[PDB]
Structures are given as structure tokens and as C-alpha cells.
């Protein structure tokens, strides 16, 4: 019913008046640790090769 999961992060929260309500400000280390598996296509072949 509940379990531990991958692709999760946790840290202290902080105010930021300059984010929209639907935005979350994320550290670069959390974002560098966490990844999203994006499928390659001719639409994104160049960008994904760059990455």
C-alpha cells in the first residue's frame, strides 16, 4: 500500500516570491541526480546528442 520509490528527493522548503504558484524552485544537485528517460526521435536527436 505504501513503499519506497526511486526518482524522489527531499529537502527543506524556502520562500520564493518570484516563482509562480505552479513553479517549484529546485537545486541543481537534486536536478543533476534525478533523471528523465526521454525517447530519441528526429525531432530531438540533436538536442539529446548534445546532452
Amino acid at each position: 500500500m505504501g513503499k519506497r520509490v526511486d526518482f524522489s528527493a527531499r529537502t527543506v522548503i524556502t520562500p520564493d516570491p518570484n516563482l509562480s504558484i505552479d513553479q517549484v524552485g529546485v537545486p541543481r544537485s537534486i536536478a543533476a541526480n534525478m533523471t528523465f528517460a526521454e525517447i530519441v526521435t528526429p525531432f530531438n536527436i540533436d538536442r539529446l546528442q548534445e546532452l
Partner: protein, 404 residues
């Protein structure tokens, strides 16, 4: 991503957010979206979950995104509203005597995302061009929504007499065609209640427009508050000598009243009321006297406040605090209760060893006749600690049963 805070009580405790990468090592949140999470920044931590497929990403983007989460099905009202600084500041900003200069107005218009680039004609052209705070909030307000509200300080006998549609106090909020025609905005107009501007924006305009409305209120109002400023200090906790004399006279009269009731009970000149024993009737009379004293002193303190008082500013806007807090800071902290009754005789017929036996007076049984600025006496301090321990125990014991 899904952004979550524990305990996850309702569906608004896990909402979808768009990631914005920023330098330091904390999760940075907008301040309107803190009330849904029940989150403050005193060391709270939150959980970020990254969906790992286009299907889950589309699911979160079309179901759980924060703008789609503005109105809750629990109580058919907004779940997030305008909050502390932005609410005190929008209250101060939409007052009738807020006049902005050309440079200040351009500074604020820099922070409107939904601005058509047209400077509005100032409300005052001569002797010097001046825009009003309502005139800029009218630019913040989206679409052509129409809304009627009333500022918290709206007198109840104003809608009957004349001046119903021209309010002397600038209460009676009226937004027409997306312009704040009149009124001071506050919790009642921008908070999480039903029929407020944020609710009507979400119902008439979409969730996207309402998202921008939240963001624009916050940015414009915070950058204006950089000019106006908001604070609180000792001077806001102080009252004039007349108010102090009135409060002390009220307390002295209340203590003499309680002494009279005690003397009546001691002489068997007190007869019980239907449905209560003599002890309970005496307790009811004493508690009524002391509650009357607390309320009268609180009213004295409240009327003593100026328009510049920052406690009154935050209470009026609804940003934080209540009139009882002002009364306890200025007038009197009042009766301390343990299990809904006065301080019990924990010693033998005594609340403390500093009192005589069988002393049902107000100070013996836990009436704090001082304010927080005046400072509590040692017995008032201990009784207040007892009353506060009751709240701590309640907060720490209700959680298991409510969660179960």
C-alpha cells in the same frame, strides 16, 4: 513533478509543479501554495517525485497541476489565497489615500506579467499626476470579472443608511469589468473563502488566468511593499494612559464583583439556578464576570489602537492575528483554564502554596490580570504555563486518533 508535504491530508497536499532550477539547496515555493500544503518555512521539508513517462507526465499536467487545484471540492472555495505580506500590503495598497507617482507606477508595472503595455490614465491629473493603488490592482485583476465584498472593518449599519454606494470608510469592495471600482481588499476579498476575487477569477476566467492573477498580485504588491514597508514593534503593543486607566478600572471592578459573588456564596445568599449545583452556579457567575472583564478590556484596547498600529494592520487584513491576540498583548491575558475549568486545587484546597485555603478569587484560580507587555506575575506565569500545556497535550494527542 509532484510536490508533497506530510501529513498528506487531502488531494491538495500533492500537487504538480513545473521545475525551475535555482542556485541553493532548498525547495523554493510560492507563498500562496503554502496553505494547501499546510507548510511554513520553520524547517519544513517536502518531497519531490519526478514522473518517469510521458503518460504520467500528461496525467499530472492535466489533473494535478496547481492551477487546476485552486478550488477544492471539499468546500467549493479556493484552497490557496493571498497570504501574509501580500495580504497586509494589499490591504494597505487599496486604501483610499494610496497615491503612486509615475516612476513608482512604472516600477510596479514592470512586475505585471499580464500587462498590455498601456499606462492607464492617472486618477489625479493635476496638480501632479498620481495613480491610485486601486487603479493598479485593476490592472492586476484579470478579465472582466464582477465581485462585491466587504472589508472586515465594514460597519454593519452602513448598508442601511445613506452612503451605501459611496462608503466613507472605503469598505464595500466593488470590482466591475475587472476594475477595482472601490473598497479595501483583504482576506474577505483575496483569501480562501467562497465568492472572493480569486474564486470568481477561477470560475469565470480559467485556471491559467487565475494562476497569473495570484502571481501578479504577489509580485506587484511585494515590490510596492518595498516602498511602503511593514513592521511591528513595542510601539504597537503600547496603549495610552487613558486606555491603561480604563483597563485597570475594569479589572478592579471585575475583581470587586467576584469578591461580592464570593461573599454571597460564603453567606449562603446565593441560590442555584435550574440545571446546576451551587458550586457550578458560583463558577458560572465568576466566569461570566471575568469573561465580561476580559471582553470589556479587549474592547478598550481595540478602540485605543491608531490607524498606524501594525497589530491592527495585520488583523484588519486578516494576514495574521486576531483581536483577542491584541487584547492579550495590550489589555489582559485573561483566565487560564485546565480541562475547561479554572485552575484546579492541585494542593490541598489551594492552587499554589502562595494562596490561602479555599480562595476562589480570580487571581487564585488563574486569572491573568496582566498583558504580555505588562508581564505575568509568577503565579500568572505558572497558571499560563498550565493552560498552554493543555494546548500542547491536545495537539500531540489528537493526532493519532484523528489519523486513525
Amino acid at each position: 513533478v509532484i510536490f508533497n508535504r506530510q501529513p498528506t491530508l487531502h488531494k491538495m497536499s500533492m500537487m504538480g509543479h513545473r521545475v525551475r532550477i535555482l542556485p541553493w539547496s532548498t525547495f523554493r515555493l510560492n507563498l500562496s501554495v503554502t496553505t494547501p500544503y499546510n507548510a511554513d518555512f520553520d524547517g519544513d521539508e517536502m518531497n519531490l517525485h519526478l514522473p518517469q513517462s510521458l503518460e504520467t507526465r500528461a496525467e499530472i499536467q492535466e489533473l494535478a497541476m496547481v492551477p487546476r487545484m485552486i478550488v477544492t471540492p471539499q468546500s467549493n472555495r479556493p484552497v490557496m489565497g493571498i497570504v501574509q505580506d501580500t495580504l497586509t500590503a494589499v490591504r494597505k495598497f487599496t486604501k483610499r489615500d494610496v497615491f503612486l507617482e509615475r516612476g513608482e507606477v512604472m516600477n510596479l508595472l514592470m512586475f505585471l506579467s499580464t500587462w498590455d503595455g498601456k499606462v492607464p490614465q492617472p486618477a489625479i491629473l493635476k496638480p501632479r499626476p498620481l495613480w491610485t493603488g486601486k487603479q493598479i490592482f485593476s490592472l492586476i485583476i484579470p478579465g472582466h470579472i464582477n465581485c462585491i465584498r466587504t472589508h472586515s472593518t465594514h460597519p454593519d449599519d452602513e448598508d442601511s443608511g445613506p452612503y451605501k454606494h459611496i462608503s466613507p470608510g472605503d469598505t464595500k469592495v466593488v470590482v466591475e469589468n475587472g476594475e477595482l471600482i472601490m473598497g479595501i481588499l483583504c482576506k474577505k476579498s483575496l483569501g480562501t473563502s467562497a465568492g472572493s476575487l480569486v474564486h470568481i477569477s477561477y470560475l469565470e476566467m480559467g485556471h491559467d488566468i487565475t494562476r497569473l492573477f495570484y502571481s501578479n498580485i504577489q509580485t506587484v504588491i511585494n515590490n510596492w511593499l518595498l516602498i511602503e514597508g511593514h513592521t511591528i514593534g513595542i510601539g504597537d503593543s503600547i496603549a495610552d494612559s487613558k486606555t491603561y486607566q480604563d483597563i485597570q478600572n475594569t479589572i478592579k471592578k471585575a475583581k470587586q464583583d467576584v469578591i461580592e459573588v464570593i461573599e454571597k456564596a460564603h453567606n449562603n445568599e446565593l441560590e442555584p439556578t435550574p440545571g446546576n449545583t451551587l458550586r457550578q452556579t458560583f463558577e458560572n457567575q465568576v466566569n461570566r464576570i471575568l469573561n465580561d472583564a476580559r471582553d470589556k478590556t479587549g474592547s478598550s484596547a481595540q478602540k485605543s489602537l491608531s490607524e498606524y498600529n501594525n497589530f491592527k494592520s495585520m488583523v484588519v487584513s486578516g494576514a495574521k492575528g486576531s483581536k483577542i491576540n491584541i487584547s492579550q498583548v495590550i489589555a489582559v491575558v485573561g483566565q487560564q483554564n485546565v480541562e475547561g475549568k479554572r485552575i484546579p486545587f492541585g494542593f490541598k484546597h489551594r492552587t499554589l502554596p502562595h494562596f490561602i485555603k479555599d480562595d476562589y478569587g480570580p487571581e487564585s484560580r488563574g486569572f491573568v490580570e496582566n498583558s504580555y507587555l505588562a508581564g505575568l506575575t509568577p503565579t500568572e506565569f505558572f497558571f499560563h504555563a498550565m493552560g498552554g500545556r493543555e494546548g500542547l497535550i491536545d495537539t500531540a494527542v489528537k493526532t493519532a486518533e484523528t489519523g486513525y
